[model samples]
Every structure is written in structure tokens, then in C-alpha cells.
Target: SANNPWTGFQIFLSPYYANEVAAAAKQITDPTLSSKAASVANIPTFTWLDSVAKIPDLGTYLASASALGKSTGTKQLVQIVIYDLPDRDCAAKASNGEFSIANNGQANYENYIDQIVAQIQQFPDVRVVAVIEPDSLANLVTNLNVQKCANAKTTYLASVNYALTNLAKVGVYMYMDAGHAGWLGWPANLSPAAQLFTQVWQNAGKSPFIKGLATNVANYNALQAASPDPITQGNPNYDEIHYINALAPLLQQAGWDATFIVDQGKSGVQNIRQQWGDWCNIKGAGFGTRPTTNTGSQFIDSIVWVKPGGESDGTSNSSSPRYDSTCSLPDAAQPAPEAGTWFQAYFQTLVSAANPPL
Candidate 1:
């Protein structure tokens, strides 16, 4: 095991400072905010591929990665979010991907995987951990009845299988998106969810095909302890850690080792509504646990920042084409920028309210 090529965890920092961090540092002059900004700036965040239209030149990114690794004397740790599956984010339209099922969507997705594999091959020496198609699997099970998701169910599975087989050959640590605790954490959803996950892996060639599952990619949910609820006492579905413990055994039973990489970038604060469905750029949220390999659980490999803080989940108003009702909720900050834009006020709030002190 020690001699295995991908045996250890290595953290990689991008050479350029993240936009959210840079924007937050300049807009909010508070020392605490600046400190937190600096802290997050140093941690590596995923470079997302949310659209097929905006694929990057692999040579350029790989060159930067090599330079960063050489300067720091560390293996370049890269997190690539392969998120452009057809009819993605079927539960909501705010972050819907460019691909759709009707117009050769399945064929287009496989083509996109070829491009990803091509780029990844260029940087074979770098340690790349990819989150393949966020919300793809979770949506297949939970939102299949929705208008956009209804016809794309089987196509989603085929695309995932294609990605797993291609990416595994090149040694990338691939994690299929399992969604957050709020979506798949309930008792009824647990068994079926794990079974679907195992089936996908088996279809892709089983063990050694994927490294693990990624939870809370861009959502806010507490990672460790529950956020103090009166109605639910130690609910298995309350938090991410508990969710993993319940689902891991089922996955293993169905022939999966089932490691995890959790997104703790914005889980520091509890959900404002007791419903656990408010998933926009929520107020009162702070940075949660930082990324680390020592999660004290055999199944949990690392706690990562899959979604960078300060990026808008979606616009609150109707000015943007990608509007979601949840974004306009009272708990959500108003005058919200379009998805992926820098939100200075929201960043300041998260910095001030951080638990365990950022």
C-alpha cells in the first residue's frame, strides 16, 4: 500500500489568488476578514468546468500547476469539478449546465469526457482529484420526475460510467458527487442512494475505478456536529459526518470501499430555516472546518473547499436570466450578483461568523 503511486494526500495552492479572496481582501478592510481571506487564499480550490463551451487549454493550466509545485516543493494538488453533464442541476435552473438531453446530449457528454481526459493526460505527474458531475447522481434519484430531469435519467448514468472509465486509467482521484446531507441524508433515501452509487461503480468496472464520493460540493451543511436542533436529537441525517457513517456500510456491502471528500467551505453556520432546503447564498453562514486529511474517520479522506466562499449562488432579483426562487428568500442576501460573481458583503458576514475561528 505504501508503494502505491497515490498513497498520500498533498495540498496544492494555485499560483494566482482566487477572485473571491482578492475581492474580499480589498473591499472589506477588517483585519479578521483579511486574515480569513489570506487563510482561504492559501488553500487550493476546485477550478470548475461547468460548461462545455468554456473548456480551457490543458497545457496552460498544467504549466502553471508544475510551476506552483516546483516553487513550493509540493506535488500540485488540483481539484477539477467536471460538472457539465446533460440536464445538470435538474432540481434547480440557477446552475443548470450547458448540455441538454434532447440534442445529442449523451454523445456530447462523452465527447466532453474525452477532452477532460486529454487535458488530464498532459498533467499526469500532478495529483489531480476530480469531482465528476456535481448533482448528477443525486438528481438522477431525487429529481427524476422534474421537467428537465425526467428524460435524462439513463443518459446521466451512461455519462458517469464513461467519465469513470476514462479518468481512472490516468490515475486521477475521481469522486462522484453524492450531494449534501440535506438532499440524500434522510433514512428513506440512504439505502437506494448507496445502491445506485454502487451500481454506477460496478458498471464502470468496480473497485480501483473511483477514489470516493464528494458531498456538499456547493451547498452549506454542517460537517461534524449538528447545528443544535430541538426537533431532531442526533438525527442520522442531520450532518455530513453522520450521513457518511450511515451510508458507508451499505456502499461497502455492495462492493465499495467508499472514501469521502466533504465540502466544508461554507458549513460553519447552521441553516436559518429548519427545513434544510434553503440552498441559496444564505445569510448567517460562516466558514466551516478547513481541508485536512486527518478527519479521524477511516472513510473520510479529506475535508475540502469544493466551492469557494463569496461566490454568488444565484441572483436574488429577476434581472438575471438564471433566477431561482430560493435566492429571493428572506434569509438570502438581497441584490445578489449572478452566480460565480464576487459578493463582498456576504464574504464579510461569513468571515465574522466563522466557528472554531478561521
Candidate 2:
């Protein structure tokens, strides 16, 4: 009976994104574009708690969300991306966490979750959804050839198990960051990915809080493409929709009739990537669907804007240790800002090119 928590309440429209949008709008000269920029902030978006240091900010965020919810006459549902894990983003150079296995990452991670639970506990009336660490276990599925992914294998599993176990205790809705269709869509990868997720859910004592999978977090993949991009490379599960269609049933067999949340924040333009795996900061990208539970599939909870639009996926500079070659690729936006920083020029493109015209 534990279905989506998204029903009835309005998902939180983040003031942080609103402020970022305001700053970006000041830089735009086009009247149409500047005026519509505010519309992006109106949509509900997930806030990322990527580093342990960011945990304390959750209280301020929830207080604002709760206050807004009270006045709006709809409970503001807050979506949080629970992103830090030991050796986080194991497959990529960017977005590595402050904690690592060598430096007591596991113990620090347990504290991180405890603190977030404490913050979320303060506003028990607010609806909160946690999207667990992106790309952690997905790397374990396909990137083990890289020594880092292989090395962090057990720790990645343990990190997620610990996160789910504790977060469930606080009664929040959680969606494990199942990497997008491009990574796990193939039958070879899909089968093992489901097995791994089911194992983790069981490890969490099969709590209902572990709702399902989060697809295409910070990646550009169509949610409901007429056909998969030319880069499909014979993978049928090419779009996020196809990915969920295939994934949900396998999870159902395991008593996890998985529902999904798809991220369309940067997917407005596809077929631009030289390779489907190019994820840093895609040029010509735009905002896609706004948050809504009217998803065509019974298995999908909602199509969400999980990645805040215009936050650089990674830096284009190769000098920094956080730099990844994907950010420098020909398809990636050049002269990009550092990861998680606002990219004003890119924000203009997102607003201008938005599918629904913002």
C-alpha cells in the first residue's frame, strides 16, 4: 500500500534555484528570455546534499519549504538528492566525496546520514523524498574494470546499505540512484543491476522507504522519446521511459514493484552527444518536463527535475583534480564553470530552449 508520496501535495519549488535564476536573469538582455527565466524556478526541483558539509543546511531548507507549504495550502514535498558516499561518483573524477575508505569514510558517512535524519526529523509534517547516491552502485555494475570502481566495490554497497537503513528509520521516501538508461539499459547490465539493487533493499531489511530507482540523474536522456537517439548503439532501452519499462517488472518479481522518478532537467536536447556516455555538461541542453505525477506508466512515480538546471556537471579545466575529460569533450560546453557552480550563459540557453517554452 506504500505508493508514491507525491500525491496531492505540491513538490517544493526551491528558493535556492529561485535566487540562482534571479542572478542569471540580470545577465540576460532579451526581454522574452529574461521574463521566462523565472518560470524555471517555479517548478519543483530536488536539492542535493552532495557533501557531508552541506548537511547542516538541510534544516534551513526544510524550514523554508515547510513555511511555503503551509501558506500554499498544499504540503510542499521536498526532494533531496542524498549524494555523498565513500569514493562517490567512483566512475568519474568529478564529484568525489570528502570521505573515502582510507580516511574513515564509513564512520563519517554514518554520521552524515544521522545528521540529515535529524534535520528531516524536525519537520516531520513535510513530505521529503531522498534520491540516494548517484552513480555509486551503477559504477559497480559496469565500471569495475576501472580500478577505483573495483576497489570501492564493497564500500559502495555498504555506503548505500547504511544510507537506506538509517534514512528509512526517519520515515522519508527514498529512491536509489539507479544510473540512467544509457548505462544500465542493456540486458547484460540490466539483469545484474536489478539483482544488485534487490540485494541492497534486502540488506536494508526491505524497508518500504526504499521506493525504487532514480533514472537519468544529471544525465541527458529522453524520458518519452519517439525513438531512441541515433547513439542507441542497438540498446533498446534507449530512453528513460524504455529503461523504466524494462526495470520495473524485474524488481516486481522480487516483491519490489519498483516505481521510478525520471530527471529531465537537462534532457531538452538529445542526439547532440558524440557518445551516449558523455555526461559532464552538454552543449545545446535545455530544461525538459516540469514535475508531475501524471507519468504515463503506472510504475513511474513522477518525472522530476532532479538536477538543478545550469549547475555545471564538472569543470572544463583539466588542471583541477576534479576535472574529467568528459567536460572537455567536443560536445560539452566550452569555458564551463566548475561543477555545481552556476553557469549564467548555459542558464540562458536552458531557458531559451526549454521544450514547453518555460
Candidate 3:
């Protein structure tokens, strides 16, 4: 049987995010907003490794998670999003990474991966699920038109290959980031994406440790079709449901393990984004479906909170070179601090807007 990391397990909630939430909540004066803000800490959300400084935080979280598992009689799974690739988010601006392909990006990224793997290896008792480089491979599929993306092309593949190859040596359960429905789900894009993913998999030596593709890493595509959005552009794979179902067979046919995980984080409300492509700190987005194994499809191993609930997607300052225009879109939440900085107002909004009434 193929490996499934989420077999009847509960994921660990990072207090790192909770620490930020606590700090953000203290600034809230409104009673309702203050209460809502504090409550978000209780939800299990994945911590993102967007920079090298954040990498060391893993061992501390892993130790706590594994210890909890020892006390609770269940090994607590820690789900981390491995971002920080050179020239990350090729199609967009808000969350540009610290590494650039030209400036020794590949070598530095491999070192980053090696450090992360070393941290994970320390907690062998804890099961670790990593969502690798959200927009790295996805951009190679659709955004080569951009000059920076075109430049990073070979580095993207080599970096990912190196990451997977080294990470596979450890027991890290990895998932390559597949773009969400709106990006790669269109009929014209689907087949080519599968081909690219399959080739990347082959290049990784077809590592058994890579369990599947992780979709909607930090985007707001619906997990199930509650209602069709005009943003989907009339494509059949509009929401994640059809998207997953459609791609399941295509990848499987390639002899891929093809298990899947979808990020439902920040997708609690629908049709808020004027464009499906607008992905920053999205306005009107709420805390999405909590991490669960009760995924609607057998092909979907888990529905994860890959994006932490309160982290800002990007800075609102257009003056900042790291700022992408997408962050200022009418669809995104406003006056946001720098990406990854605490956005107290946005956190309150996500809390009040949470689905299932958190």
C-alpha cells in the first residue's frame, strides 16, 4: 500500500502562530473582536518556513507536538509549509522570497533544506508533513512569460529536485505544491501541469517519501462546490472538488502515488475576491475548514490548514519592492502590515468570519 501520513491522526497546532495571535489580540479593544481574535489560537494551523530564521523554530514545535503525542497516546502530526524558494511566487509579488536564482539560490536553498531536514530528523517520533514551495513548481506550469520566472526556470526544477532528493532521505512526508483550481484546473492547463509534475517526480528519483500533491497552499479555492464562481472562468475544475477529481486519474495514469491534500485555510467565505487570481490577505476571507482526514475524496488524504490563519500574505506598502500590486487589490484586506507581520485587524476579521462558527 502507498504511504498515507494522515491515517486517522490529528495535526499539531503551532503555538508560534498562537504567540503571534496572542500579541495581535492584545491590541483589540472591541469586546467582540477581542474575543474572536483570541479564539483563533485554539485552531490547528500550519507554520510556514518562509525564511532561514524561521527554520530553527521547527525543532521547538516538533518537540512539543511529539511530547503531546506521547502524553495523549497519539503521535501528533506537524504540518509545515516549506516556502522560501529563490524567486518564490513567480506569478505574483506580495510574498517574494529572500533567495534569488542568480545569487547562489540553488546552493543556499539546498542548505536551507538540509537544515530543515536536520531539524525534522531530531524528532523521529513525530510524523512531519511538509508542503513544499507553494508557487515554485506551479509557476513553472503557467507563468514563464514573466521575466523573473523565466530566469528562475532551471533553478526552480533543480532546487525542487534537490529539496525532494535530500528530504526523502529523512522520513519527511512531502507534498509538491500544485497550483489551485483557478490556476491549473482549466482544461488547457491541466494536462500540461500533470506532465510537468510527473517529470519533476521522475527527476526526484520517484521518492516514496513524497506522498502526493498539495493544492491551494495559501489560496481560497473551495474544497467542495458550494457555489460556482465567475472567477473560475467557466472551467469545469472551478472549485477544489472538481479540480481534485479531474486530476486524480491523470496523475494516477502516470504511475504517480497521486494522493492529495487541499488547503482550506482562509476560504471560509466565497466570492469575495474580484478575481480568482487575487491572492493576498484576501478581504472577507475567514478561517477555513479545520485540518481533518474526513476529506470527501479517497484521493484526498487530508484537508489541511497549510496557511496559518492570521499571517499577512503581503505588505500593503506598494513602495516596498517586495510589495506586489495584488496586495492592494480591492479584493484583499487593507492596511495590512508587511507579509508575515502581525495583522491584528485582519485576524479579527478572520475570526468573526470563521466557518463552523469558531
Candidate 4:
């Protein structure tokens, strides 16, 4: 909804970015990445949810639509997705191990999902994608006991399925998140993700929890239709994307060609140098394809920009805000994490550049 703004679209709130923000802010004196840490600390102080913060807006909703108006050729409208919920282990609620945010009095846990769904429903015609929970299930094995993992898995599936079943009631598209390919390559990984939610469906005697699967959400794009070979160890950005490909076969083997979506939010700024290490690259690399509202891939629904482009991850020591022109260059920290910083720079770069192709 325009009132809520930034509603719809799958937004990838990086665990790395969230971790980087906390790591940056909680710094003390005499650190190796001291100044860097300090910058990170002050960063993430501003957020999009706050209506008052002066941070810039990506405005892709308006900008993408407007750009679509000007172009002669087919212009793919942009779609955005956010993955802000805590990783799954937190859902366990074990006194000593829970890592998710505490419910601050408002609707906590699954109820928050309902709130987001309602807000997204307010928006008209805009295709807002949602990724239920990033690494929510993967963490079942990464951490937690078998019982804890199983319980967390069940709770998460129930929450997301409730959201999707309800959202679809109001006409919203929901996608279940699949941790990228590297992790899913092993049967260990694939088995849990595929079985967890679907089992919940079977138990409840209901359909699947989501519309499809979303991969490489917070990672780089390695699942393009043009790229035939599945990701292997030697591939750049392989860890995340490789597991994502593994999910396709797992899902197919289970009897589902579920719609597939890949996120290219800030991929335009991919750091070929670091291969998107923990998503620290600041400079955007390039646009994947405009958001595809439609798709030909029977198994794959469409490609999208789930993560917003211009948000600052945190602050920098230099006057150059993360989105400023100078910071737009490639480096570990070129792009800031806030929503505003990156989008304005991205838009400015678009209008001022004489050459269409770089």
C-alpha cells in the first residue's frame, strides 16, 4: 500500500547486513576494522519502516513504472522483496539459544506476517513479492536439536502457510524461500527443506504453503535460464547459488515444478572481485532484467529485484553517504545499506549517462 509504502515485493534484508550493522554499532576502541566498524555501527540506524527518517527512497514503484512509460521496447517493471525475519533457529524459543528479535508488544512472531500481508494488499496493481523466512528451515540442521528443529520447522510452516492462504484470499503472491544452491547440494540440505513445509501441508491436509520457491535472494544470481549447467564448487558465488539449483531437482523429484524466482536486487553492483562476499560489495554491477510480471519458464515464474537497490547497510566515516557518487565505485563497502542512498545514485547514474550500454 502507498500508505505503508515499500509494501509488496520480496525485500532481502541480509543476515550479513543485519549482522554487519550490529557488529558495526557495538564496536569498542582498538579494533582492526575500527573505523570501518564504527561506520557500520552508525549505519543501519536509519530504517525504511520509520516514517520520519530522512533517508532516500528507491522509488522503483514510481520510477520503474515511469521508465516503462518512456521506452519503446518492452520495459519490465521492477519488483522488490525483503527477507527481514530472523533465521529459523530463533523460532525454537529455547531460553539460551533463541536469536530472533523479541516481540516489542505489537503483534509478535507469526502475527507480524499477517500485518505485512495486509499492508501489501493495500497496494494496487504493483506486484509485491514475499519470501517467507530466509534460512528459517536451513537452520533446522545448521543449529538446534532435532526436536527443536522439527518444532521450529512446523511453526514456521504454519505461519507462512497461514499468511499465503490468507494473502491469496486477498490476492497476493507469496513465495517460500529456499536457501541458495551450495547448502542444498547435499541430500542433507535438500531433504529437510523439501520435507519440512510439504509435510506440514500433508499433516494439516492442506496445499503447499507458498506460490513457489525463491533462490539466490540475498546472494548473487547463478540460476539464469540461459545458464544451463547447475552450479559447482569452483563457480564464483557458488555457495549460495549452487544449493539453489539443487532445490529445483529436489522439488521436481517430489512432483512439483513450482514457479522459480531469483533476486537481482543489487546484483547490478556484483563484485566480481570478491564474488559478493557476505554482500559487502557497495557498487551495483548491472540490472538483471526488468521485473518480469509474466514468464515463459513453466517451472520458473519470473526474475525480480527482491532486494531494494539504494538502501544503506550502515554509515561511512567519509562525507560520502553510501549512495553518494564516490561510494558507487566497487569495493567491500561502496553501496550503503539504507534504501535511499543506493536508489538516488542509481537513478542519477541512469539519467546522466550518455551511453546506454556500459
Candidate 5:
């Protein structure tokens, strides 16, 4: 077997026909779009378990996973995001989860994790990577001023600990959310962020512990030196890799020994004047570094499509039910589908403007 634990697992390809590549394949006539679509169509993307109520139930998700595992004739690398934390996306209206601690949320969350574990138990031979909760822990520390976010900090930590402790039991390769460089790269947030993450992971007390930390979950931040956004060039720690190098040592000092996985779905291209802080589906962005284990960094494990490209981050205007101001900014893309829904035009744009040519 290869040294990398993930090497044995076959990347799971879902049968769904409504994602970015499928939409592009059907609508685009040019060879460029066709080639980009063909290349990305077969690449494995995450199956986001965003909502306990709206997204597919656990049964349906595992069924598709098993089917793909069998089709590949090998244990599949199943990437899943357990995103339904209490008051999820507290800083924003879009991507808000259904549960909250107020409404029997703790019990409900425990039950949800239990259901997911049961499904994973059914596939004992399959290899799984569960991205515990994106933006949950990281935002609890960074975006405290947002409504209800500061008050729920302790609860958020507890919820994440519960997830880490339980998920560790099933041989799943767990990656705790570490947010992105744009949020944690600065002096004010980096050290404290490391301390908080260390406390949570240490508090979990799982044997073998979590495999790593996952960054840039659904955000657009460049990973390489040649940034489309010139602003990043000035700071040494501007890119994801540099951020990890600075943050990883702090984590090590806190007694954490872990690898890292980064999301590269919508980060390949950036704008000179683009606000790094503005996370809504930003304009002039392109597909970033593709999924790969060879990150050329010792502590980094892989770069993945944790967030599927072409899915709208959120709506850009008040006409939509959820109104996040970031989405309405001038640099933000024009109106599109709600967060997590397919956006064909955006998909084509990302592929066409890809930094390295998808």
C-alpha cells in the first residue's frame, strides 16, 4: 500500500446528472467548455449534508455512496461535510442550518451523527473522510459580533467535540474545520484560533485523534504564488500554503500532530481589488488547484473540492429570501441560484477563466 492512508480509497463519483459538469456538458457547444466539463465530470466532489431537513436523508446518501463504491470495485474515498450545526452560518443568512440548541438541538444533533455513524458502520470496508462542521468552530471565534454567534460559542465547541469523539470510533478519517487563510491569517486571529482548535481537539480525547484540519471549506482563496489577486503577493502568508506553515507550528506547540486538507474549488483566479474578506461567490474567480495528495508540504495531506464549484454561495439581493450583504457587493457575481444549488453560467465562467486552464 502507498504511504498515504487515502491512497487505497477510490474517489467516489456520484450518478447525479444535475451538477456543474453535467449542466456545462449539456449547454456548452465550445471545445473549451467541453474539455473542462469532461475533465471535471469524473473528478470526485463532496456530498454536502448541509441540512437535516432539506438535504437528502442519511439513507439516500449512503446508498449512493455504496453504489459508487461497488461500481469502482474498490473501497471509495467518500468526502462528506456534516454541516448542520446549531446556528450554522450565524454570521450570514444563507446556508443556515435547521437546528439550534434552543429547540432540542443538542439531542437532535447527536441523533443526526448517530444516524450517519450507523450508515458508515454498514460500509465497514469503505474509506471515509468526514469534514465535521465547516465555519462552525472557526466562526465562533472570529465572527462573534454577529447575532447569536457569540452566545453560542461554548455550545459550538461542545457540538464539535461530540462529533469528533463519536466519528473517531468508526475508523473514519476525520478532518476538523480550520476555516481559510483569509479569516485566520492575520495576527489577531491566528494564535487564538490555534489555541481554540487545540482545546477542542484535546477535549475530544479520541485515540488516534483527528487525521487533520480542513481549510477554505467553501471559500475562494488562492493556494499558489501566481495569484490573480495581486494583493496577496505582498504578504508572505497570503496563500493557503503559507498560512498553513505559520499556523501548523502553533498547533504543534499546543500538542497537536495533524495533517491538513484545503479546498480549491473556486480559488484559482482572484481580482487585484477583490476583497479577500468578501466570501460570497466573488466575481472573476476561477477553479483553483485540483484535488491531489501531493501538496509538496510535509504536514498538508491533500487539496480537495470540499465545496463543489458552481454552487451559489448565496443570493446577491433582497429579492432572495436570505439577504447577506456580502453577496450584493459590486465584486460579487450577479444573481444566481441559492447557496448549494447549481449555477451553470457560473460554472462555465469558472472553467473558462481557470488560472491554469482546467
Candidate 6:
């Protein structure tokens, strides 16, 4: 039980996180992007897995992470790619059923895997957390048959195995999708229709490449907390007991050694309702630890916000103005535009002041 405050969890702030932070920072300072680069040139940055972050795409970016040597501290976080299936299959498999879904050009799985592995090798001595193919196993598994599932797994195993071998220079932890506490499995529950997670886990087969299981990556706590009849405070889909009860057996059965992590980035300020149906936009929720650690000292290892709490997914854009950066409403809850923008300017100002313009 290592409970170091710093060791408790790693908030994975990648170059993508940096970019969003930078973009948001610049926007806050000069919403129009008017500030000169030199103006924010001296911004304080750790530049952890920044090599991967330096570029917009995964392939070119990862090249940068690998370049760092021992000079980069051992405590920082790193990034990993989760897919390599054709773009059509990745997006279409999750979004829709028809060919239209597969052909959308989001980027194929094969193309993605090639690019993903290239990027993983760039960093040295940093930590890496891989949330491989989140919806792939839990949600999309239903739509994809055994053949498609096998194909997806083949691609994933190749990618995972490669990283495990080459990226040994740094600490790495990888977790496969465990659906949600709401989805049942070992330690059986009320849902006759719902396939227990153990079934999903067994069906997916054990991956030595796996670290442990991940749950609630993008879900809000309301859904996890309340289920079945909300009035009863018992959720048929998921409850803390379900998560704790199920994993105890699943982990022991699978004979896992790696630790598991939970997505608590926004549980502190959850939006979705308990029944696992309603999604909301409540304010101030950020992070929380589990009610209790797992029994074998193997309960959830870290409560992390894999998905930055305030960030918006593709469905919502900044232009909408209906909500600020995190894809929610315009309110005090969202990250103040300036919180990000001012950092850019603030750094620039610090640099300029040091030099003192004549």
C-alpha cells in the first residue's frame, strides 16, 4: 500500500493536455489569438511527455517523447495509444452499424496501430498509462462478432506487446475496459439481461499485456451511484458494491498482478444521473477516492481523471458559446477562459520583464 500523496495517482497531462491548456490559455489572454508567441515564451512547463505533445498527430508527436533521457525526472506521466483498427471500424463500430459508419475516414484501425506504436517509443524514464480501446470490448463487443473481436484483439495485443517490450525504460501500467460497475459480472447481480463483466473479461480472454481493469472512464458519478429504483438508492446497472464485489473475484480468477485505476476526474462534480441514463452538467465536481480500497490490498490502485474533467468531446465545440471549454454550460463551474489564457501571457510577461524592453 504505497499512499504517497504524489504517488497516490498520476494526473496524465500529456502534450494534448498541454495543447488544450495552451490553447485555452492563449484564448483567455487574447481570445482572438493576438498575443505574440514571444509574449508567452517563458511559460513554466514541465515538458514531461511533451515530445509526443509537440505535434498534433500521434505518430510525429511520440517521436518527441522518446528523445528524453535521464534528465527527464522519473515521476512524470506518459501517454499510450489505444487503437490500430481501420478508421472506419474504430468510429463506425462504436457510432453506427451500416457501411456508412465504417467508411467515415475517422482513421482505420490498421493505420492507427502503426501510428500509435511509433509514438509510444519516444519517451524515456517517464511513466505511461494505457487505456486501450475503451469502448472496444465493453460496448462494441456486442456489435462485433468473434471474428471481428479477434481481429481487434490481434491488433491490440501487437501494439501492447510492442510497448511493453520497448518502453521498459519507463514505468508503464495498462488496463483493459471493464465496462462499468453498472455492467454486471462475477459476484452476480439483479440484471438477467446484462452480461456480467466477468463474461466480457473471459470472452476478451486474458492479456498478459494487461495491467488491470478500468471503469467509469467517461461516466458521471450520478449514474454509478443511483440505479434500479433511484428511490431505493440501489442501481441495477452499477453501485460501489457491484464494482467492489465483482472485481474481487474477477482479479483473483484472472490472476492479475498489475494495479487497477478508476476515472474520478469528474466524479467530484458528476453530471450524469444514477440510472445510467440521464447525463447532466452539475458544477464543481472534480475528483474523489473510492469508498474503500479492494480487499486483497488490490482494490482500485489510483483514482485518476483519465478524461480531463472540463474538456469537451467532439460533440461540443468552443464556438457554440453555449458552454465554455469543458462542453458544459456557461457558468462559474467551467475553467475560467483566463485560467488557461493568462498562463501563456503570464509566462510571456515574466520573460519580457526579465529582459526589460528598452
Which residue pairs does candidate 2 place in steric collision?
none
Error of 3 at 84 (Å): 1.7
Task: Identify the leading candidate in terms of lDDT.
Answer: 2
TM-score of 1: 0.91
Candidates in order, TM-scores: namely 0.91, 0.97, 0.94, 0.54, 0.91, 0.54
- What ranges in model 2 sit over 4 Å off? none
Candidate 4: 10-residue stretch with minimal lDDT: 46-55
Per-residue alpha-carbon lDDT of candidate 6 for residues 240-325, written as tens digits (9 for 90 to 100): 44564455554565454335556554454333343343222333343333222332334555554455433432222344333233
Q: How close is candidate 3 to the true structure, as a TM-score?
A: 0.94
Q: Cα RMSD (Å) per model?
A: 2.5, 1.4, 1.9, 11.8, 2.6, 10.3
Order of candidate numbers by TM-score, starting with the best: 2, 3, 1, 5, 6, 4
- Clash-forming residue pairs, model 1: none
Give the C-alpha miss distance for residue 253 in model 4, angstroms: 4.0
Question: Where does model 1 exceed 4 Å of error?
Answer: 1-9, 15-19, 57-59, 71-73, 93-95, 226-235
TM-score winner, 3 or 4: 3
lDDT digits (tens) for residues 59-123 of candidate 4 = 33434444443463332222333333423334222221122333421124445545555554554
Model 4 lDDT, residue 109, Cα: 40
Which regions of candidate 5 deviate over 4 angstroms? Answer: 1-3, 17-20, 29-32, 53-73, 93-95, 226-236
**Whole-model lDDT values for every prediction:** 0.76, 0.85, 0.83, 0.43, 0.75, 0.40
lDDT of 2 by residue, 1-358 (tens): 2577888777777778888988888889997788899667778788899887777778888888788877877787778998878887777766456888889988888889889988988898788898998888898889989888898899888888988998888888999989888899887788899999999999999998888989999888999888669888789888988888888889999998778999988888778888888887789998888778888888888889889998888888888888888888888998887888999888899988888678
Off by over 4 Å in 3: 1-3, 30-36
Report how far off residue 105 is in candidate 1 (Å). Answer: 1.6
